[PDB]
């Protein structure tokens, strides 16, 4: 008995809706509804990084989408890494519209390990890594304005287990990420047990993730326990690129279990 | 093995991203490749309304061509609408191009000009299936931009390509400013001494469109190239449906016109 479901996919830093193309295809092909979103200044979003210094505007595309969702319609919300922040806010704001939330190697802050804590730890693994660089559109007196992912950083830390053509796709598509202030992030993402915590949650681990160490990972899982943790072996950070079929079946299974 | 430099130019709605399979094959084989985004294409910062003049659309390529030291020749590949862009580049920097390749591209010449090839190309897209136009200059002025619908992409463009590539494109196609024939005709002027001096190869690649193939045959007849090659089983986006074949063809062309 087929039950049509609605998957909503949220990308990580530098990326956009385009990174899910293999997953979007498998979904639409099986009869499910899927929405892959471009966050602020991501993918083909019209905004430029410098134009959106407020974290609020980076998340607006998902919040607007969440608000426009029809009555009584539930979705399986999936966030990849940094996208974890975006969906956490969506969970806190519209808990009743989310069947189950999935954190794919996602930043999963909780009441006992706030957003800024997770953002600082995350920042350390990206800033200064290989050829990644920052800009100073506001002068040396102020914090760097944006972060730009380098091709070597992508090939080594993110796409090391993915098809080489996927690496080429990424280099031609990744955009700068405005370096949002922790203070601003801390005010936008505030989670409570009664709302955020009432949403079924599952975390997916990428066994060969070289972008986000398992140390930091186990920390979030331990300090903000999900309803379940699943693994995907042989996957690098971008599971949707390196292990698409496995991620797809894992998502259908998760969808079925929490419907 | 002589290292070479391939410069790829996309067609309407697309961007440098559509060449990802070809770009991957060239880098791994040792060659250098540049996949550019034209104005308001791919991740180019401009929005269609900001580039109402065709010159604005071509700027990323003209700009790239100028930065090239005359001694570093390239193989310039233009796809479909991209044919107009490389034609302009052929006229301005003729000596920097070893050979110019038109992948089912618009190939205007002295006998069949830019406005002619354009009007024809546009009739195959405007009003087709779920495509639509916008009016940012008011309801009384001609439409400003053309947007590619997903059904049109599935049926008329990616019909012979992997389903994921259709999904990829639906997530990345951007609007195209509806340039004026008058602007285009004035921007794309070609002369036998410059444009005509560049080695030119046309690649035929289309499958279930007799009229499309006819139009393509009309340009080859009116503006004869130095050679015509063919690729079978390709839909509109050969780089998606027949990657390995397109790649092989490009290397062959490159090794022959050093
Ligand atoms: C505190 C500054 C905000 C910037 C957030 C940096 C963290 C991004 C983590 C995701 C890494 C990736 C390649 O997906
Ligand atoms: C004078 C009209 C110029 C605008 C014509 C736009 C149509 C694009 C045709 C090329 C087909 C394609 C997208 O590959």
């Amino acid at each position: 008995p087929f039950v049509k479901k609605h998957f909503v996919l949220v990308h990580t830093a530098f990326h956009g809706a385009w990174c899910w193309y293999k997953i979007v295809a498998l979904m639409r092909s099986s009869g499910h509804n899927v929405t892959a979103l471009d966050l602020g200044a991501s993918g083909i979003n019209p905004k430029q990084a410098l134009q959106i210094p407020n974290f609020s505007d980076y998340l607006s595309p998902l919040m607007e989408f969440m608000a426009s969702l029809p009555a009584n319609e539930k979705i399986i919300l999936v966030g990849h890494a940094l996208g974890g922040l975006a969906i956490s806010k969506a969970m806190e704001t519209f808990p009743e519209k989310i069947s189950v939330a999935v954190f794919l190697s996602g930043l999963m802050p909780g009441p006992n390990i706030d957003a800024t804590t997770v953002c600082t730890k995350a920042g350390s693994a990206v800033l200064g890594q290989l050829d990644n660089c920052v800009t100073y559109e506001n002068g040396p007196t102020n914090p760097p304005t944006t972060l730009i992912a380098g091709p070597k950083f992508l090939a080594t830390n993110v796409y090391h287990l993915s098809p080489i053509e996927d690496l080429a796709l990424a280099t031609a598509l990744v955009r700068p990420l405005y370096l949002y202030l922790a203070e601003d992030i801390s005010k936008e993402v505030v989670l409570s047990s009664k709302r955020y915590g009432s949403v079924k949650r599952v975390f997916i681990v990428a066994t060969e993730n070289d972008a986000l160490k398992k140390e930091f990972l186990k920390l979030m899982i331990e300090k903000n326990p999900p309803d379940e943790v699943k693994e995907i072996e042989g996957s690098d950070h971008v599971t949707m690129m390196s292990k698409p079929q496995q991620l797809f079946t894992t998502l259908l299974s998760i969808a079925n279990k929490y419907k």
Side-chain angles (χ1 to χ4, degrees), chain A residues 59-256:
Chain A
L59 301 186
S60 60
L62 171 69
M63 296 306 102
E64 285 176 51
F65 171 85
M66 290 300 299
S68 77
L69 278 188
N72 298 298
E73 189 184 307
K74 296 185 189 173
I75 65 179
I76 291 89
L77 190 59
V78 185
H80 177 221
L82 180 65
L85 295 186
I87 68 174
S88 296
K89 179 168 182 64
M91 289 158 77
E92 178 68 17
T93 307
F94 312 96
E96 73 290 1
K97 292 183 183 184
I98 308 173
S99 179
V100 51
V102 183
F103 292 71
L104 179 68
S105 303
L107 302 188
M108 190 172 69
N112 278 286
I113 177 175
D114 63 53
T116 181
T117 295
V118 183
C119 279
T120 296
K121 288 188 167 61
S124 297
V126 179
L127 282 166
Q129 288 303 88
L130 299 187
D131 54 349
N132 291 347
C133 67
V134 304
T135 60
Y136 287 100
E137 310 299 306
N138 290 164
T141 169
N142 300 299
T145 58
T146 75
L147 172 56
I148 303 177
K152 297 178 183 177
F153 160 83
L154 289 181
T156 306
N157 298 43
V158 185
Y159 292 72
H160 66 292
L161 297 175
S162 306
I164 50 183
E165 62 265 26
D166 284 318
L167 174 61
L169 180 59
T171 65
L173 293 172
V174 295
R175 306 181 56 187
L177 175 74
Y178 186 93
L179 286 175
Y180 296 104
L181 272 48
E183 146 188 48
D184 174 23
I185 296 167
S186 295
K187 300 177 185 179
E188 284 306 315
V189 186
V190 183
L191 316 171
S192 68
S193 291
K194 187 60 183 301
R195 304 176 67 73
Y196 162 85
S198 72
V199 181
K200 292 310 174 58
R201 182 154 49 84
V202 176
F203 188 107
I204 299 182
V205 174
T207 288
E208 298 307 302
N209 200 314
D210 285 346
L212 294 177
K213 45 182 171 91
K214 68 186 71 62
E215 169 232 326
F216 169 37
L217 185 41
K218 297 180 178 182
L219 182 60
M220 298 188 268
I221 288 180
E222 180 189 66
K223 303 190 71 58
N224 182 29
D227 285 289
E228 186 177 359
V229 184
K230 306 185 70 66
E231 294 197 319
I232 288 192
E233 309 193 302
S235 161
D236 45 31
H237 190 49
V238 283
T239 309
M240 71 285 290
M241 297 285 192
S242 58
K243 294 292 174 174
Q245 297 179 301
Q246 296 92 330
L247 175 61
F248 167 68
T249 73
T250 296
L251 290 172
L252 288 182
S253 168
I254 289 173
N256 268 162

